[model samples]
Target: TIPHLAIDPFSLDFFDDPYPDQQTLRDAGPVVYLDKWNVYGVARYAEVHAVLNDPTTFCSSRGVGLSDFKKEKPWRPPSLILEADPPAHTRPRAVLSKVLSPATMKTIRDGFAAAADAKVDELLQRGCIDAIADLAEAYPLSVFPDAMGLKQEGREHLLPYAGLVFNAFGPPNELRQTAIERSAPHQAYVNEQCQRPNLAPGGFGACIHAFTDTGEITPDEAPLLVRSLLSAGLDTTVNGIGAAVYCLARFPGELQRLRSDPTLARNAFEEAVRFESPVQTFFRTTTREVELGGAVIGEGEKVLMFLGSANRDPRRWSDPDLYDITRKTSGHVGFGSGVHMCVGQLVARLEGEVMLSALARKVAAIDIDGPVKRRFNNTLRGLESLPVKLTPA
Candidate 1:
């Protein structure tokens, strides 16, 4: 038997800060039907892992968005990689994985680390900066495009594009409408960047075209994978960097610990990801009637997996709400698990470590000086502006 919650996770109030509401939902059951969205929300760590890993009964092909792909007006073709299931999802994954293999990543790491050092040194000399815009956004945007080998004619679209893409995964509203309007004029430029002709010779876009030329995947299906890289790559890393900065600012002692030990960059990134997940929630549609923690999930129902909530679930984590960099946060679901689990997570992790280590090594401490505004969207948790004062060592 399932317990009924007095509160629904879909309540807009939970969007700002969801930890309390998550507690309500988790205690209610592993899964509970949210009447507002008419979807099931998986709040506990256990159930979220189960649903994410089981792509058979619950599919991504119907689309990872809130509306069924067959029923909605798509902004673009479904992400060939992100919205795909096995067998069909295999070839593209294989081609891209091989190209972005650990070996390639090893080569990219040196440049990324160098870039992180340059940016941090510049900011450190200035004595203060917005870690989000200067360090976080600047670092990944610098490295990802170069690694992918795209020219970046209109790199400005990176954030709005990702914001819209993640928002489109949820219920359409003012947020989605705003993102669509903002992204409209820049869409063509973004698409063009994926082409072999438009891409610079050495990046991911060129490699994608190379795979297509070699008959790995059709030419038509190739750009969608590139678009997936664009959509999935940017803001998560940006927001993650911001979240880490926020954590350090809030906890001065922890910041000191990290500053003294540069190697803690890995721990800082993982713990920050668990505390404030960049990609918060994603949907999975049910193919058959099924039960989760006593709740009935009907056919065609969408299950909104609260990854941010699961990462902090008190039942699974000790001192669940604190943002300690020393915690063994490896098992946290900051990145989704299973096949759709972010295949490029290593890329994100690398950027985080390089950026964080650079910033920590340069800065003695950071202080939040103004209000931190959240850039609200359905699937991602990001900051609109985080004003902070960074003190250099």
Candidate 2:
């Protein structure tokens, strides 16, 4: 039998500090039944990977949240890629994959890299800055909009809209309610920006619309798919960059090593992802009666995969909690695993790499300058404020 636990993963307390609870869930059983939400949790790396790898049995179609789409209304239109399974997910996934391909990355790389260098130079002049607002949020917001062909105005709405979408993946708790209230206008702005006329020529949003010509996806579906890009794009990368900066701040030696060899910037970002796990949890429902970790999960039951916990699971990693950039983080679930794995990951990585690499080249040391505050969200883990002092190289 799956061990029963009354832990509330969505509670503000748990969101504030989840490591203790993550350890409890992993220690309780391979698959523990969460009594509060009446859901099953795959907390250990092995089972989480198993579930993520087999999308057929562990389906996403019912909705990847506590409120099943089949039974209740979705807060918004479901992602055609994320909320879908196999044949339905295939084409949208293919188009997005091609759209964000290496060739496409090359188009934006130089501009993003130059922006990163400039941002670092500006931060060095400040000497002390909120890493969260100054570097993490600023860097991504700088380039992603123009990459997507967004106009100069109203780009501020991106983060709140992303926060709303990610938070809605959990139970409709206070966090979700607050995000819902705050993000409504941001959602309206994002939707308006998705229209073809609003997009600039040769940008990602325009390119997504071009798919209509190839009959890959329809005109109606194109904007929604671009909506997917807008939804997934900003906040994750922002928090990801925050996680890296926070990790390096805590481990000054890691920052020194990164400064010594700038190429480790990519590795540093990835290792921080393994350590900090910006996107913490995601849900998948059982397609049929299935056995996971010797416990049978009934069809349609929600199985919450503790991705942050899985990334740090000691069973699959040596000294998993350590923030060592040299460790091979290849199979880490930081970007998740399997078919539904983050499609925008390459873009996120590119932004993280360029920004951190630029910092490594210019900043001699990174030290925590003031109090750190954690941002609470049902699905994402990152800092709301990270005060840091940067020593110029």
Candidate 3:
């Protein structure tokens, strides 16, 4: 029998604390239909991994969201990279892959490390602060823009633009509606930021545009590629870092383990991503009728992968719910898998690693100071405020 659920996963009630509901969805079966949204959900680990691998049948080109581009207009020009499939996605992905390659991290490491040290210094002195606002959000905003060569002035538009991008991935809910209304200025600012002249020499933005000189990508296509860079880098990285702090504060034993061995900071961030799964879900449109989890899904159907649930799937991990930094977290789909994996992942790893390393070296006694606040988004999980009391090591 085909499993069916009536839950609206996008509701704020689900958004506030989603684990139990996510567990229910995962247990219902590998593939289940949500009655409320009329979409198929691939919630278990194996199914989500397999679906992401088979992008030919479960295509990203139609849309990586609820509203199919084949049926209606996209909110903006669809991402030339994120929303693109195979042949269309190939060129932009290659360009971004080269621009944000591991080698690029070596050049940007000093700046990211310096920025992390300064943020840790400030937070350590305060002794108590909102980790999300003061550190997780602050540290990335400080370093990433400089790396991208975005001007200091309109930097505020980054998250709002990212918020619009992620939120618009869902249906016309309150979250999407309100975000759409306030997105005009953000849209304009980010669009302008992607232009060649607005970026500086030696920055990732300029590197992307320079491909035009080689005739690798069209001059007109360059700005959209830059937009893809900002979208992949900013808000999601902020949430990834935020999840680290929340995970650490709630689990002191694991927190001190990293403090004892600062090198664990890198794997610690990977485990945090596995545990928290900040970008919880993304939709894929089916290109042809296919069988998934014993259910025959028709062509042109919208299927959402519960990435957060997959990371914690008990079938895939021993002690799946446990927060252990030492866990062999290889192959976690927190960043998705295979062909269309995250383009800015190295940059995200660099940001999370540097900040966690700084905290491990300098901060002590990561005691949760107050009620932690949750930031609700249709697709992303993040902290709005995480109050913590720290003692300088």
Candidate 4:
């Protein structure tokens, strides 16, 4: 029998506290058979990084879940960005790169920061708050959709719809089934909102559709592109923002560093992304017989790369388990790596930086009011409700 590990990573208990399990995966070796899913797993930094960059041999088009797209159909349409391999992925990425270009953040920075300030102002007043529902989810839903030009009326459906999308990234399980049933009615609204007519001029969705006229992408492809953005736009980011605040709340010294220099705000968010590693895992299919982490495998095997585990691989980082805002987090796989690296990372970082910066400027301290209720997902990690007492400066 080949080397194996028995961590049923998809189990609810694993999600509740993944660090110990994650460490076990890393310690087990680079290429361990995650027998629970009949997949190979790469958990250390070097191995995970190498696999993500070597996408040619380790492809994503076979479905980024346990179900190989070439065999079983993905429950929903596969993401043009999150799933497609190169060549087929190139054109769409080019179009999106243009939409969220370097200049994109500057155009909305002031407006977004004001929105963050306003939210922080509101939270600072409340004293005690559920950071996730009240801030993490609220701030993103309020500002990001406006940035996309979606109508304010039906925004409540976003989180549920996004939760459904993230849940589908795993094997068919109770969690995925529950999320699907809960978000069934919300699917159409999200789809409708992505249409060209429903989008506002000067919005990100509108811009994606505009590319269709130039023949860069087809008319039908435009809405799909919008759908891809919306699919990842909220939930991953809500978790990301929550990860930043949660990290700071747990690490007082790191929070003090952020408080001392508000400019460290961006780095604070960056380190949290690395420390928390919110987008935990992604799966890929071997395009050829691949050798990884001293393991040789046949073609067409599935490999699961733990982005979360890799970030904390001690062999690659000093004090990998610690949360340090000043640490060099530039190359961390928190937003992932290579061609499929998160497309909306700039938006996520903008949200994280602005909010954490606002908190640093005005909040004297952040105190956890109680044990956080964790929001468990097959691929995403976050707090469901982080109750905290904030002291205003």
- Candidate 4 clashing pairs? 62-69
Superposed by TM-score, candidate 4 places the C-alpha of residue 207 at a distance from the truth, in angstroms, of 0.3
Compared with the true structure, what per-residue lDDT tens digits does model 1 show for residues 296-388? Answer: 778888888889989988889999889898999878888888887787788888988988898678888788877777777778887877778
Of 3 and 4, which scores higher on lDDT?
Answer: 3
Which of candidates 1 and 4 reaches a greater TM-score? 4
TM-score of each predicted structure versus truth: 0.95, 0.98, 0.98, 0.97
Off by over 4 Å in 3: none
lDDT (Cα, tens digit) per residue for candidate 2, span 1-393: 779999999888997889999999999999999889889998999999999999998888889877788889888888899999999998999889888988899999999999999999999999999999999999988899989999988987788888888888989788888888756688889899999999999999999999888877989999989999998888999899999999888888888899999999898899988898988998998889998889988988999999999988888999987899788989999898999889898899999999889988999889998999999889999999999999999
Q: On TM-score, who's better, 1 or 2?
A: 2
RMSD of 1: 1.8
How many clashing pairs per prediction, in order?
Answer: 3, 0, 0, 1
lDDT of 4 by residue, 1-393 (tens): 357888988899999888899888888877899878889988899999999899899999998877799988776677787789888898888888888887888999999899999999999888999889998989988789999989777888888888888787787889887887756578888889889999999999999999998877899888989998888888888998999889888898888888889999988899989998878987899999977866888899998889988999998989998999989998899888899888788888899999999999888888999768998888898989999998998
**Candidate 1 residue 365 C-alpha distance from true site, Å:** 0.9
Q: Which ranges of candidate 4 are over 4 A from the true structure?
A: none
Q: Is 1 or 4 the stronger prediction by lDDT?
A: 4
Regions more than 4 Å wrong, model 2? none
